[PDB]
Amino acid sequence: KRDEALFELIALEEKRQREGLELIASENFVSKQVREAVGSVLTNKYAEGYPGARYYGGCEVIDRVESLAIERAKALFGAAWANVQPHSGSQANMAVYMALMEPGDTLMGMDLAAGGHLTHGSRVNFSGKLYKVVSYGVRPDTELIDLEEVRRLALEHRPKVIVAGASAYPRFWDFKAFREIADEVGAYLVVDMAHFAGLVAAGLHPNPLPYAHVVTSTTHKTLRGPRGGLILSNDPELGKRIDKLIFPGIQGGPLEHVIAGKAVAFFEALQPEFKEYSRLVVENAKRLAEELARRGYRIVTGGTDNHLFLVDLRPKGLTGKEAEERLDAVGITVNKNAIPFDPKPPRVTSGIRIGTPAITTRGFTPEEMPLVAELIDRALLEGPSEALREEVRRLALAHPMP
Amino acid sequence: KRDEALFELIALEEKRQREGLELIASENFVSKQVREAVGSVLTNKYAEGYPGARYYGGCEVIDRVESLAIERAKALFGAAWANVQPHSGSQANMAVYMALMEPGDTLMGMDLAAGGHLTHGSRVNFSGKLYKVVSYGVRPDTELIDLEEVRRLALEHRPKVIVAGASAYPRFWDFKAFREIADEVGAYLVVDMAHFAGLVAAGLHPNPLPYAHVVTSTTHKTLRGPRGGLILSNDPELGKRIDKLIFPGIQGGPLEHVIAGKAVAFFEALQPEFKEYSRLVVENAKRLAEELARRGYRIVTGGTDNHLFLVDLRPKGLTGKEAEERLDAVGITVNKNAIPFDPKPPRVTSGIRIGTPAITTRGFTPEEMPLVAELIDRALLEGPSEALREEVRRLALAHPMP
Ligand SMILES: Nc1nc2c(c(=O)[nH]1)N(C=O)[C@@H](CNc1ccc(C(=O)N[C@@H](CCC(=O)O)C(=O)O)cc1)CN2
Ligand SMILES: Cc1ncc(COP(=O)(O)O)c(/C=N/[C@@H](CO)C(=O)O)c1O
């Protein structure tokens, strides 16, 4: 018997994805071959351990798959060591923190309200439960990280680990300065590149590998791979320590079908086509930010260096929650996001976050960003209408999904 | 461009799975429709939070998928609450421990050599690093759990959490007695049913749900679903606590394509055909253990009540590592496994673990277990030969599976 109730929902989700504009910055659409690998029989194999050093028979082919994912990751990112087993970006961070720190040690990371991730020290996350947390944010007058304040905080608190990277920070990172600061206090520098890993792979974002002691990431988001995690380093001895925390430390059997999907995603990113895709992501984001500024919004930090930007909605008197709702009503998905020193509480906010990776995967190009900006503005100014929902639906449908 | 090299490896793994006898007790073969759900576009959507309580818009269909998995898990096991987001059995156990304990509390679980899982308190695992561990074993004479020793250990050490369930214990569990022992010291009883979850669902193993405070599980062993984790409870208020530890506590975005696969697996397990499948799993395991005993192999406890058994290879002068290699040389896949009171460490061991869920899925019957026992025996006694490898290959190819 086919599970028809479940597959009816999958068909509805396929239709939903085709018929709207996905502007949430973390999203992307994986290729059919990434899906083919993830849906493979490799899920059937228990393969605890590492290639050639497994706790089960029968892993000869799985070992070739996992080694292929590892070697491609090292080639793609210019790394000396990789671990491709983390089930998610959160598990990548967890293994690294547990390899470098004991509970009670001090972790330094970007404040959630300023753009940091839950795993960078939030009190409701294991990162802020197991470790003492020092957070850094952005300057009120620049909207940017203040390296002098990062350094001041690190000297005062002597973190064991400093995390650079974020989920909602629209500019480049000074990885060299972060490593200088970590060196001054004897901390490890961990770079969580999840959001911008595709741009690093494409050479369109500074590469953190030479400066970080360890780099963590998601394989999804701008890298456009299957949902899962990744760890990289230029230090294979540190790598051996982290391998032990992934297994037997915090995971059991790895998802070898997902690892096969990671090998496919790395294959795709090693092709020259991926650099052009990534160039268009960055150009779409800059252009869309510019076109919204021309229509009367303000862009936090004035713009963006990467795939995402933050819209300050105060020129038009809207909250992030209101804007989210109005845009959802016409099939445009964004997410509310606090602006620096936001005057509104976090369930409300004064901003939204937009990213271009997903629409760029569907073939949107920079000359189409004025129209996207116009439709966003109309939704915000006019509120929802059937006509605007259908214009968005036609536009989405005209940009086929992988 | 298609990633031909990676897909050639997948084809080699498909061929390996067709042409050998997969006797690893923790493995199975998922159906084509479980694969189809896990390969779906649902990977593309970030769905942090829970159904009807998401961070982001656009989850209206995802919520119906996750809710379907939740409600089918509740119906399958008679639970009042379920969490279907854990990425793995390891993450299901981690979240439960962090919901019920603080680092430094006492955790009581089964000794690893006696059958307990790494996440039941191993010092190289988060369970033995974050918590103070005390372990119960089995009796040296019968190799069975002695509930009176379990009771003494609990009274002496006053654990906050007692774990019942195991990776390699071949007999039934007295969950009522474990709960009485937990109540005597005010401990929470956590049952990790990962190995026997399918047998519970089929009514062929005592159900822990009435007696445990919390039940954890994998979806991919006897449940024959996608690779992932699961949490259940008959207390929906305890469930709300644990939901917070899965997210935002230890995970980020859930794998909604895998969750769709879990829904499919639970649908398959609710079918009458699954009860007959599970009956044959247990009959095959009992018969195969009896057939090897009649060839002179020592079976730990003399037999099995479930899908797995352990062979003590000390009388044959072989380590489990050597047995695993010899069997794999002729296409019979097992894993070396610790046995109770094992003098050798986990990378060597004195035994092998065999289970029947995977071959039973391919249609192996109890009347074929005499032939499987013969092939295992010859592999250990004579070592490898192409004629023996081909005999194994023919028997495997007689049992096709899409
Ligand atoms: N009873 C039981 N059997 C099981 C497991 C289990 O947890 N318990 N496994 C659960 O997955 C599998 C084997 N996995 C294991 C992997 C590593 C270690 C371990 O203790 N490793 C140590 C020391 C190794 C050595 O020196 O031999 C380490 O890595 O430091 C144990 C089991 C299958 N059989
Ligand atoms: C009782 C129990 N709980 C949790 C897990 C952990 O499940 P993930 O592997 O993280 O999905 C397992 C796994 N067992 C494997 C070896 O780990 C095996 O037996 O062969 C288990 O047996």
B322 Cβ contact list (under 8 Å, min separation 6): none
- Say yes or no for a CB contact (<8 Å) between B10 and A268: no
Prior bond to A248 cis, omega within 30? yes
First-residue to last-residue Cα distance in chain A: 29
Q: Kindly report the CATH number that applies to the domain delimited by B33-269.
A: 3.40.640.10
> In A, which residues are within 8 Å of B60 by CB distance?
16
A323 Cβ contact list (under 8 Å, min separation 6): A311, A313, A334, A336, A352, A380
Query: Residue B236 corresponds to which amino acid?
Result: P
Q: Are residues B197 and B223 in contact, defined by beta-carbon separation less than 8 angstroms? A: yes
- Residue B318 is classified by DSSP as -
Q: Are residues A158 and A184 in contact, defined by beta-carbon separation less than 8 angstroms? A: no
Interface test with B, best of A19, A40, A60, A242 (most B CBs within 10 A): A40
Give the Cα separation of A61 and A362 in Å (integer). Answer: 34
- Say yes or no for a CB contact (<8 Å) between B255 and A227: yes
Query: Residue A345 corresponds to which amino acid?
Result: P
Give the Cα separation of A321 and A335 in Å (integer). Answer: 8
Instruction: Kindly report the number of other CB atoms within 10 A of residue A387's CB atom.
Output: 11
CA A62 to chain centre: 27
Concerning whether A221 is annotated as a catalytic residue, the answer is yes
Q: Is A116 annotated as a binding residue?
A: yes
B174 Cβ contact list (under 8 Å, min separation 6): B147, B206
Instruction: Kindly report the number of other CB atoms within 10 A of residue A101's CB atom.
Output: 18
SS (H, E, C) A279-291: HHHHHHHHHHHHH
B210 Cβ contact list (under 8 Å, min separation 6): B78, B175, B234
- Give the tokens for residue B360: 């039973």
Please identify which residue in the block is written with the tokens 């009190």.
A123
CATH fold of A4-27+281-397 reads Aspartate Aminotransferase, domain 1 (3.90.1150)
Nearest CA in chain B to A54: B347
- Say yes or no for a CB contact (<8 Å) between A56 and B335: yes
- Give the tokens for residue A224: 């456009």
SS3 B6: helix
Burial of residue A343 (number of CB atoms within 10 Å: 0-12, 13-18, 19+): exposed
Helix (H) or strand (E) holding B109: strand B106-110
Q: Are residues B328 and A58 in contact, defined by beta-carbon separation less than 8 angstroms? A: yes
Helix (H) or strand (E) holding A164: strand A161-164
Atom of ligand 1 nearest to the CA of B348: 27
Query: Residue A377 corresponds to which amino acid?
Result: D
SS3 A54: strand
A45 Cβ contact list (under 8 Å, min separation 6): A56, A58, A59, A62, A256, B13, B27
Alpha-carbon Rg for chain B in angstroms: 21
Q: Is A205 annotated as a binding residue?
A: no
Residue B306 has, within 13 A of its CA and on its CB side, a CA count of 33
A336 Cβ contact list (under 8 Å, min separation 6): A319, A320, A321, A323, A324, A348, A349, A351, A352, A353
First-residue to last-residue Cα distance in chain B: 27
> In A, which residues are within 8 Å of B29 by CB distance?
41, 44
Burial of residue B158 (number of CB atoms within 10 Å: 0-12, 13-18, 19+): middle
Give the Cα separation of A368 and A244 in Å (integer). Answer: 48
Closest Cβ–Cβ partner in B1, B9, B251 for A65: B9
**What phi, psi does B337 have (nearest 5°)?**
-150, 135
Helix (H) or strand (E) holding B151: helix B147-157
Instruction: Tell me the C-alpha to C-alpha distance, in Å, between residue B380 and each of B40, B308, B351.
Output: 43, 19, 12
Beta bridge partner(s), residue B311: B299, B352
Ligand 1 pocket check for A248: Cβ under 6 Å: yes
- In sign, the C-alpha dihedral spanning A79, A85, A91, A97 is negative
Please identify which residue in the block is written with the tokens 């214009």.
A391
- In sign, the C-alpha dihedral spanning B337, B198, A41, A30 is negative
B77 Cβ contact list (under 8 Å, min separation 6): B200, B201, B207, B209, B215, B232
Instruction: Kindly report the number of other CB atoms within 10 A of residue B295's CB atom.
Output: 15
Q: Are residues B38 and B372 in contact, defined by beta-carbon separation less than 8 angstroms? A: no
Question: Comparing C-alpha atoms, which of A170, A246, A229, A234 is closest to residue A208?
Answer: A234
Q: Are residues B35 and B28 in contact, defined by beta-carbon separation less than 8 angstroms? A: no
Burial of residue B172 (number of CB atoms within 10 Å: 0-12, 13-18, 19+): middle
Give the Cα separation of B112 and B163 in Å (integer). Answer: 12
A182 Cβ contact list (under 8 Å, min separation 6): A154, A162, A188, A189, A213
Question: Comparing C-alpha atoms, which of B358, B336, B375, B17 is closest to residue A58?
Answer: B17
> In A, which residues are within 8 Å of B33 by CB distance?
2-3, 7
Please identify which residue in the block is written with the tokens 């799985």.
A62
Provide the phi-psi class of A125: left if phi over 0, else alpha when psi is between -120 and 50, else beta.
Answer: beta
Q: Is A57 annotated as a binding residue?
A: no
> For chain A, what are the domain ranges?
4-27+281-397, 32-270
Ligand 2 mutation pick, B22, B26, B111, max ligand atoms within 8 A of CB = B26
Per DSSP, the residues of A305-363 read SSSEEEEE-GGGT--HHHHHHHHHHTTEE-EE-PPTT-SS-TTT-SEEEEE-HHHHHTT
**What phi, psi does B248 have (nearest 5°)?**
-85, 10
Ligand 1 pocket check for A240: Cβ under 6 Å: no
Using N-to-C axis directions, what is the helix angle for A272-294 and A369-382, rounded to 10°? 40
- Give the tokens for residue A30: 């994986």
Supply the residue whose CA is at minimum distance from atom 7 of ligand 2.
B89
- Give the tokens for residue A124: 């409701």
Give the Cα separation of A86 and A83 in Å (integer). Answer: 7
- Give the tokens for residue A255: 């998802």
Question: Comparing C-alpha atoms, which of A34, A63, A77 is closest to residue A225?
Answer: A34
Instruction: Kindly report the number of other CB atoms within 10 A of residue B148's CB atom.
Output: 10
Catalytic entry in B221, B286, B378, B389:
B221
**Hey, do B7-25+279-397 and B33-269 end up sharing a CATH topology, with the first three levels equal?**
no
Atom of ligand 2 nearest to the CA of B118: 17
**Residues lining ligand 2, judged by CB closer than 6 Å?**
A 46, 48, 251-253; B 26, 88-90, 93, 117, 119, 165-167, 192, 194-195, 218
Prior bond to A103 cis, omega within 30? no
Give the Cα separation of B81 and A94 in Å (integer). Answer: 27
B90-101 in b/e burial notation, b at 16+ Cβ within 10 A? Answer: bbbbbbbbbbbb
**What phi, psi does B216 have (nearest 5°)?**
-110, 160
Give the Cα separation of B376 and B313 in Å (integer). Answer: 13
Prior bond to B159 cis, omega within 30? no
Q: E strands within A5-103?
A: 21-22, 49-50, 53-54, 81-83
Q: Are residues A81 and A232 in contact, defined by beta-carbon separation less than 8 angstroms? A: yes
Atom of ligand 1 nearest to the CA of B119: 7
Q: Are residues A186 and A269 in contact, defined by beta-carbon separation less than 8 angstroms? A: no
- Give the tokens for residue A326: 């109005």
Q: Name which CATH class applies to A32-270.
A: alpha beta
- Give the tokens for residue A355: 């990213």
Ligand 1 pocket check for B250: Cβ under 6 Å: no
Biggest alpha carbon–alpha carbon distance for chain A:
64
Q: E strands within A47-86?
A: 49-50, 53-54, 81-83
Give the Cα separation of A307 and A301 in Å (integer). Answer: 14
Q: What angle do CA B338, B343, B349 make, to 5 degrees?
A: 35
A310 Cβ contact list (under 8 Å, min separation 6): A168, A170, A299, A300, A301, A337, A339, A351, A352, A353, A354
Beta bridge partner(s), residue B132: B106
Instruction: Tell me the C-alpha to C-alpha distance, in Å, between residue A116 and each of A136, A263, A324.
Output: 9, 28, 20
SS (H, E, C) A184-224: HHCCEEEEECCCCHHHHHCCCCCCCCCCCCEEEEECCHHHC
Catalytic entry in A106, A119, A216, A218:
A218
Ligand 2 centroid distance, CA of A321 (Å): 42
Supply the residue whose CA is at minimum distance from atom 5 of ligand 1.
B117
Supply the residue whose CA is at minimum distance from atom 14 of ligand 1.
A55
Question: Comparing C-alpha atoms, which of B18, B36, B26 is closest to residue B265?
Answer: B36
Give the Cα separation of A57 and A73 in Å (integer). Answer: 26
Concerning whether B50 is annotated as a catalytic residue, the answer is no
Nearest CA in chain A to B271: A1
Q: Is A350 annotated as a binding residue?
A: no
Closest Cβ–Cβ partner in A6, A12, A227 for B267: A6
Query: Residue B207 corresponds to which amino acid?
Result: N
Using N-to-C axis directions, what is the helix angle for A256-270 and A60-77, rounded to 10°? 40
- Say yes or no for a CB contact (<8 Å) between B118 and A252: yes
Q: What angle do CA A232, A234, A240 make, to 5 degrees?
A: 70
Q: How many CB pairs under 8 A join A and B?
A: 251
Question: Comparing C-alpha atoms, which of B378, B367, B371 is closest to residue B396?
Answer: B371
Nearest CA in chain A to B125: A249
Q: What angle do CA B207, B146, B102 make, to 5 degrees?
A: 70
Please identify which residue in the block is written with the tokens 């605007």.
A388
- Residue A81 is classified by DSSP as E
CATH fold of B7-25+279-397 reads Aspartate Aminotransferase, domain 1 (3.90.1150)
Q: Are residues B92 and B229 in contact, defined by beta-carbon separation less than 8 angstroms? A: yes
Residues in chain A: 402
